Amino acid sequence: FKIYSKHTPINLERDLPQGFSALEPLVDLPIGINITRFQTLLALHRSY
Amino acid sequence: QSYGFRPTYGVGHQPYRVVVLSFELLHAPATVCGPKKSTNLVKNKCVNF
């Protein structure tokens, strides 16, 4: 696995930006795993 | 069962510290390797880089 990342500055405030952006590989783990289903989780508050 | 590990014990009963280092070669890239080149630098010579 080799994650490609970018942290771009944008001021257009709609949908997808219309420009030229390039990502870079920064973290590679050659570890070995089959991937079928992914997801992602978010930090929020259940009012504590 | 117990050790004791007295200094007055025999040579067969003295405490010896042993590290049995082991390795495995999985289908993953190797990680525990020695220093590869680690020698020196030159310049402006007909040399094999």
Curated annotation (Swiss-Prot), chain B:
Lineage top rank: taxon: Viruses
Effect after changing residue 27 to P: Increased resistance to human covalescent sera neutralization
Protein function: Attaches the virion to the cell membrane by interacting with host receptor, initiating the infection. The major receptor is host ACE2. When S2/S2' has been cleaved, binding to the receptor triggers direct fusion at the cell membrane. When S2/S2' has not been cleaved, binding to the receptor results in internalization of the virus by endocytosis using host TFRC and GRM2 and leading to fusion of the virion membrane with the host endosomal membrane. Alternatively, may use NRP1/NRP2 and integrin as entry receptors.
Subunit structure: Binds to host ACE2. RBD also interacts with the N-linked glycan on 'Asn-90' of ACE2. Cleavage of S generates a polybasic C-terminal sequence on S1 that binds to host Neuropilin-1 (NRP1) and Neuropilin-2 (NRP2) receptors. Interacts with host integrin alpha-5/beta-1 (ITGA5:ITGB1) and with ACE2 in complex with integrin alpha-5/beta-1 (ITGA5:ITGB1). May interact via cytoplasmic c-terminus with M protein. May interact (via N-terminus) with host bilirubin and biliverdin, thereby preventing antibody binding to the SARS-CoV-2 spike NTD via an allosteric mechanism.
The species this protein was found in: Severe acute respiratory syndrome coronavirus 2 (2019-nCoV)
Region (Disordered): 27-49
Name the record gives this protein: Spike protein S1
Impact after mutating residue 1 to N: Reduced host ACE2-binding affinity in vitro
From-to range in the entire protein, with total length: 493 to 541 of 1273
